[PDB]
């Protein structure tokens, strides 16, 4: 007996199903670590991360909500992106879009 214990049924949960995705190789060219969150507009991340910004347009990381991916200086890795939904209107970040798309 453990007070308030969970009895989670075994298995897995499929995230962001039915949405467009794409893979991109990213390389940190800066001298300081960069960490990106699950819902940040990938195309507007720290300028030191070198990748095809055009392909990342309207995309975010395809990782569980609330988590992040870290890039130490010089680190190169391939990430999977999932397309934004809703109205697909981007406001904020580095101020590159500020509107639909």
């Amino acid at each position: 007996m453990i007070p308030g214990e969970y009895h989670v049924k075994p298995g897995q949960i499929a995230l962001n199903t039915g949405r467009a995705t794409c893979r991109v190789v990213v390389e940190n060219h800066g001298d300081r670590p960069i960490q990106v969150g699950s819902h940040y507009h990938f195309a507007e991340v720290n300028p030191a991360l070198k990748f095809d910004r055009q392909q990342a347009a309207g995309y975010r990381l395809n990782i569980p909500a609330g988590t992040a991916v870290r890039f130490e200086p010089g680190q190169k890795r391939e990430v999977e992106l999932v397309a934004f939904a809703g109205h697909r209107a981007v406001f904020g970040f580095r101020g590159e879009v500020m509107g639909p798309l």
């Binding site: 308030g4 969970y6 499929a14 819902h39 909500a65 992040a68 697909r88 406001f91």
Partner: protein
């Protein structure tokens, strides 16, 4: 991508199909539904989802909620579901999926710059409890009740005076006015009951016009057929509720005479089992009638090994009875009956009794209404197994039946269900957040009208709010003017119209009671059973359709020694 169910539960709380144990009881709940879109859950924090342009949108204050409770596991009479809860203008705005429509799908609860966040993942959220049997013996009772998870208190009294020690009555205009003024200082919604024992209607109307939302008929002031009929007549014309504590002495007649006097009119019978007062020894048979809304007081819930011993002496001290004089202890024996005390637990499990209340400091524990209600459910599961209404391998239905006893049903009984009583849109945001290991025992956060009013708080000077000692302390929702804005003082329709609030210069929000005459046993959520119940005059045995109703006393209970320092 993909995530395992265990890792998912640790991050966002449980989802459909997962089960959670309620504190240290044998009660398990199973998530029936989850209103989220997997991968789009909102989470607050460094690098998380609720950030500008991401989970937080660009809308103005009017187009977004003031507060959002994220990933909450709701336990209410209507369901046990996982969802986000939006609060706006101090009321429940929506139960759904929170976020920013600009980049997220299925958003029904918009989060903007004006939105505060309460992280409820891994927590259970419930409506605030409603205790309708309060003796206003001291103001300290409000904090004790609030800490336990009770946000509305209905009762009567004027302080530690003899009349109040014995009855829930605030006698006359002067004291009623005085108590309505004092209520502004307390962090809970309040409604007062006046003295209903009089055979002159105008003396009752005055009290109602002064502000009471109900009338208490108590045997100490004379629970005679004349008085009862008088109170019910006025109640019928002023749309207020009557609470009854019948003639235990059988002085004016037996239970059947009292029922005859009531004449099919709506009435809330207090402590229907009898130990707390009422026709000896069959007041319990009242739960069979359609116009009777029956409740229990808590010292008898549930039946345990020490119950009779403590009660026999409690009654003796409370009524100033002389233990050595045979004539007094006979009346003691007539009131405290093992037979009716054991049956009461079962009647709650069957839904024949529809409410639980305290009877604060007059044979009842103000901070134990919720706690004891769950102890009964635990004891009944252990002894009787699954209810006939259960579906699936969980105790979901039993949980819905019991939570209704201290939330929606008391609200319906007293005509305030339009404001409070459950987690439904439009209702006052009186919410209680619980950690599963402490469910029903010690709350994590108690919200009143959209503001946190009390919560556990650690060292004030610490670097974080968690270091010891951690104990309950009043928050901003309990302070001066913020308090007034987040609480309600209930008035009768007559008082509201007479401008009582303006005359007394009441500072809190005002709510009017309505629909007290039209409620019947059939309206009590999950507790509408009208059993063919009988009580043997000699043996005191309780039978329903001839079958004996009884239970065994507990030697140990959950939600007890594992949680309290004393």
């Amino acid at each position: 991508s993909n995530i395992s169910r265990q890792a998912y539960a640790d991050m966002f709380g449980p989802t459909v199909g997962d089960k959670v144990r309620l504190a240290d009881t044998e009660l398990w709940i199973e998530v029936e539904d989850d209103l989220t879109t997997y991968g789009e859950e909102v989470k607050f924090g460094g690098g998380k989802v609720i950030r500008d342009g991401m989970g937080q949108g660009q809308m103005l204050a009017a187009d977004c909620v003031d507060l959002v409770l994220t990933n909450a596991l709701i336990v209410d009479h209507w369901g046990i579901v996982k969802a986000d809860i939006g609060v706006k203008d101090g009321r429940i705005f929506a139960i759904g999926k929170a976020g920013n429509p600009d980049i997220q799908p299925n958003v029904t609860i918009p989060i903007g710059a004006a939105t505060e966040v309460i992280a409820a993942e891994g927590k259970i959220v419930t409506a605030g409890g409603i205790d309708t049997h309060i003796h206003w013996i001291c103001p300290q009772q409000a904090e004790e009740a609030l800490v336990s998870g009770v946000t509305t208190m209905v009762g009567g009294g004027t302080g530690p005076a003899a009349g109040t020690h014995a009855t829930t009555c605030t006698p006359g205009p002067w004291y009623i006015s005085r108590m309505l003024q004092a209520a502004d200082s307390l962090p809970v919604n309040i409604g007062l009951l006046g003295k209903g024992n009089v055979s002159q209607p105008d003396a009752l109307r005055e009290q109602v016009a002064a502000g009471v939302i109900g009338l208490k008929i108590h045997e100490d002031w004379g629970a005679t057929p004349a008085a009862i009929d008088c109170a019910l007549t006025v109640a019928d014309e002023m749309d207020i509720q009557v609470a009854l504590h019948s003639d235990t002495l059988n002085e004016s007649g037996f239970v059947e005479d009292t029922l005859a006097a009531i004449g099919g009119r709506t009435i809330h019978t207090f402590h229907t089992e009898g130990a707390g007062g009422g026709h000896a020894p069959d007041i319990i048979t009242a739960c069979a009638h359609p116009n009777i809304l029956p409740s229990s007081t808590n010292p008898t819930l549930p039946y345990t090994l020490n119950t009779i011993d403590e009660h026999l002496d409690m009654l003796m001290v409370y009524h100033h009875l002389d233990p050595d004089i045979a004539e007094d202890v006979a009346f003691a024996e007539s009131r405290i009956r093992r037979e009716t005390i054991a049956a009461e637990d079962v009647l709650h499990d069957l839904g024949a009794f529809s409410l639980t209340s305290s009877d604060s400091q007059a044979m009842g524990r103000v901070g134990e209404v919720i706690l004891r209600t769950w102890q009964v459910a635990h004891r009944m599961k252990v002894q009787r197994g699954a209810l006939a209404e259960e579906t699936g391998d969980n105790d979901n239905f039993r949980v819905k039946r019991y939570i209704a006893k201290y939330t929606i049903n008391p609200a319906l009984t007293h005509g305030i269900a339009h404001e409070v009583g459950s987690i439904e849109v439009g209702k006052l945001a009186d919410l209680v957040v619980w950690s599963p290991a402490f469910f029903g025992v010690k709350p994590a956060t108690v919200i009143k009208g959209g503001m946190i009013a009390i919560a556990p708080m650690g060292d004030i000077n610490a670097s974080i709010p968690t270091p010891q000692p951690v104990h309950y302390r009043p928050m901003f929702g309990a302070l001066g003017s913020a308090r007034h804005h987040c609480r309600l003082t209930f008035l009768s329709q007559a008082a509201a119209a007479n401008g009582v609030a303006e005359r007394l210069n009441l500072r809190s929000a005002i709510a009017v009671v309505k629909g007290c005459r039209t409620v019947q046993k059939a309206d009590m959520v999950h507790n509408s059973l009208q059993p063919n119940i009988t009580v043997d005059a000699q043996t005191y045995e309780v039978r329903v359709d001839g079958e004996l109703i009884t239970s065994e006393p507990a030697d140990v209970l959950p939600m007890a020694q594992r949680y309290f320092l004393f």
